Amino acid sequence: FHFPSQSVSFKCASCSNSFTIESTLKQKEITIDICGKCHPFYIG
Amino acid sequence: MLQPKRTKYRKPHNVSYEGKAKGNSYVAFGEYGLVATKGNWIDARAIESARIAISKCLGKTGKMWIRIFPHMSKTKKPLEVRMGSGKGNPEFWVAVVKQGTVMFEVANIPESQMIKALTRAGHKLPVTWKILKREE
Amino acid sequence: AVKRSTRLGCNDCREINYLTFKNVKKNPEKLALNKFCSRCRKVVVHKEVK
Amino acid sequence: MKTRTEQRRLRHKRIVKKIRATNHDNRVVLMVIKSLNHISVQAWDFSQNIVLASSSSLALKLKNNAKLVGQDIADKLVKLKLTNVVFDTGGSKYHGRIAALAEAARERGLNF
Amino acid sequence: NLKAHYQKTIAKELQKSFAFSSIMQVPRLEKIVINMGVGDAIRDSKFLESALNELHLISGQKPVATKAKNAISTYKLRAGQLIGCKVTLRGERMWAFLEKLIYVALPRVRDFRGLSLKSFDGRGNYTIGIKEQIIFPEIVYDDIKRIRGFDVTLVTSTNKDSEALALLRALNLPL
Amino acid sequence: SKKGVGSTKNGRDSHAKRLGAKKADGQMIRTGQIIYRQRGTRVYPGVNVGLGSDDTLFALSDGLVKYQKFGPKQGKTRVSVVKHKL
RNA sequence: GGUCUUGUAGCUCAGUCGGUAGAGCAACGGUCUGAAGAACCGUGUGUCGGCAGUUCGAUUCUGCCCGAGACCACCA
RNA sequence: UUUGGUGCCCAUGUCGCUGUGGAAACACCUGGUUCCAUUUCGAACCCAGCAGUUAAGCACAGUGGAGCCGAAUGUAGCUGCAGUGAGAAUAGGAAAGCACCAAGC
RNA sequence: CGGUCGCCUCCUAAAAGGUAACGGAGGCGUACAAAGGUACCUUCAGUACGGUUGGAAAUCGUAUGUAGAGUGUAAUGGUGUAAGGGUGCUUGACUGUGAGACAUACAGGUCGAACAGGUGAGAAAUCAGGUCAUAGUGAUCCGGUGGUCCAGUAUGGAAUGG
RNA sequence: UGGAGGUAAAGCUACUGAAUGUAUGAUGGCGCCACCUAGGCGUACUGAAUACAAUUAAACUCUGAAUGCCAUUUAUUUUA
Ligand SMILES: [Mg+2]
Ligand SMILES: [Mg+2]
Ligand SMILES: [Mg+2]
Ligand SMILES: [Mg+2]
Ligand SMILES: [Mg+2]
Ligand SMILES: [Mg+2]
């Protein structure tokens, strides 16, 4: 009854990690440049 | 000149003044006050005259308090006109005074000075006044 | 006065049984109700009649 | 804003006001009440402010789907030869367990 | 999912951290609401349709359009002319959106140095001001004619802010 | 010497409808008779009494009539019809 | 003394019963000219008599005040 | 008698504050697959379940902080100079009460 | 000369009702296929704090807040679980009546139990004969239109009437 | 005996206006600096809101009589 979002995976470009819970899965296993554990506030 | 800034209605009915001084019955701020012994309508002009008299005979030593205030309006049909055809315009405000209301009171100055100041003021008001000292 | 009234009419016996009110200017759609028609002795769809 | 039970109490107050205002006859109401564990019912008669009969899942039953609280209270009422009541949904909605109870009550000679 | 780690460690470690002796005296995050306040649609900026589209794309939760609770003469808004947009999300979508935000969106901001200095309402709630829609991965270069941000909230199951600080810190939120 | 007057502008008033209390306590009444005529429910309906479109109280059955107070600070009023001991 | 009318840009006059201030010249700049006029190009200014209400933003719709204008006022 | 539920009343029935407890119940609470439901959503409603819970609600004790109630006396108004009796202020009271049903007592 | 001529709300109106003046204040000659009927769901305005666009005041979130909010509309009364707000279905904004009362000089005006027919909402109880209530109105006479289990100047029609 | 009622009165932190003194004073007037755009010092003064004490009203009411009114009982009287 809506946009069929699914467990879309992620790809960290620097943290070498991934995230896959649920998102817009039109581009499943998508790449992210700014990694989660890369920002100065998060790490630094 | 004491006067309300603005009101709801411009032509209120007359307010009676034959009672036993609802409110303002006792002195509250000074050690000597002026008390009437016959209720009557006293307008703003007499109020200002008494105020300026007390101020002029007081000096830069004490204070004076005014209790009453001309809230009620009053109408007066113009000159040279038959009656009927509506109600006249408002001309002068007036403070209703029931018999036995403290209305003027001063403090912080010699005792004979209160006596002389209040007696000086009382001769401007139509009502028969009376000197009253603050209770203990 | 304003002539805001209007008359409802049956579509089977074609009587003018009912009368009602309606602002032509706002809703110009002709009323299509279904009330009790005495002559037909049942509930019949009524339409506006000029 | 409320505690998921205060709303139920307010709704029940609304409905009991409705019956107490509309019931020209003296038909005994049938107040069903819904708990997260199980269900219970009492037959409140107005103009007297008493309970004529009552029933509950606490007649040696488990949690509720157990419509026997309809049949037993129907038995009590028909023994008291009333068999005509106004239903009351408490603060709940007429559905599910309440609907099953009401159908069980109706099928055994209640008039509602 | 975040709940995995949440009732894996965080619940009991906060339980032991503060003197509770009650497993669920620990704060629980209740909900997040979404707002953007589309005022440029006085009568027509875009019929808000595109903004509704990205707010639908960010999360399968259907956006709801709000009505003007009053009327303002300064603007062309008078008792209606629906403006704004609200999205309330809970359950698993709540935690999914929370991780997606805190691990993708804010690090992708221009300069996410820190926050949470005083943004609490004072009753255990917090709001983040989002600057632009293009910040989030669930959006294309094409978007509404203008670039608008978001308004999010974090409401806890408590009112005193000490355990609010404790919970937000314990989930690695930037301060 | 006469002068000019006029423009009273305030010489209108409406008919006074006789709203009030048509039935006091201890009165025999038969169904249909109206107890209280008012504008707005200054007197709520109790038991065995009705409320018309015009908010005119009227009994539904035959018996004595009783007034009674209630409400937050004993300010609201019910009027009700008590049956005979038949 | 009463009953109406009007008050808008610098001036003189216009503005769907609600979402709106418009001309001509006056003032500025440039062009022409020995210079000044005249002439040609661009320009510029507008909060609607002052105080109060209805109002979905009142110059606009009503009330009070101010100012002026008008046909008129002691028996006839 | 305790607890739960309900009704009648309407703050002397409130709003708080500090503690005590959950046997049965009462609630949170666990999930949305089923009926049903969200301007959207198991928030609420509705399902089917009791792993944990005294946290909150709930109840019991204390608390007079705010709010509510308020004597007697005197006085204002009346109504033929005696009765009539206010309002305001004050001592003070006040941590609801009344009933039926169900389990344990 | 000016102003007014009917109806509605308040005050004068002296705690039942009624009560005049060229007395004091305001409106009306309506509006609504939903602002009705019904079932269900829900409950203020303002303030404080937090939040980009966005400002004193948009939206949102959390508390406080006994109503200062709302009710198409002048005034009054009433109304916080409502008479206020939303959703689904719908035309009872029905037919024939009407015991009994209200105010009355008359003409007129108002409320209304209850019965029958046939409906709508609701599981049912029940509710629905317009709207929270009070203004939104004009007598006959004359003529015009629709229907018509009526008459038709000797009879059959028709004109013409009821 | 019961009841309806909002007048006399009274009160105004019990609401709508008007309004007195005191205390803290938002705001602004003034001067003031430094700032060309954000603010700071006192502010002869205007004075928000709160607190204490005192007021006023046909069209103000948290309140509030007696008389009067309606009904009823007892007792008496008259055929109105
Ligand atoms: Mg209406
Ligand atoms: Mg309605
Ligand atoms: Mg109407
Ligand atoms: Mg013939
Ligand atoms: Mg013939
Ligand atoms: Mg004919």
Ligand SMILES: [Mg+2]
């Ligand atoms: Mg008086």
Ligand SMILES: [Zn+2]
């Ligand atoms: Zn027909």
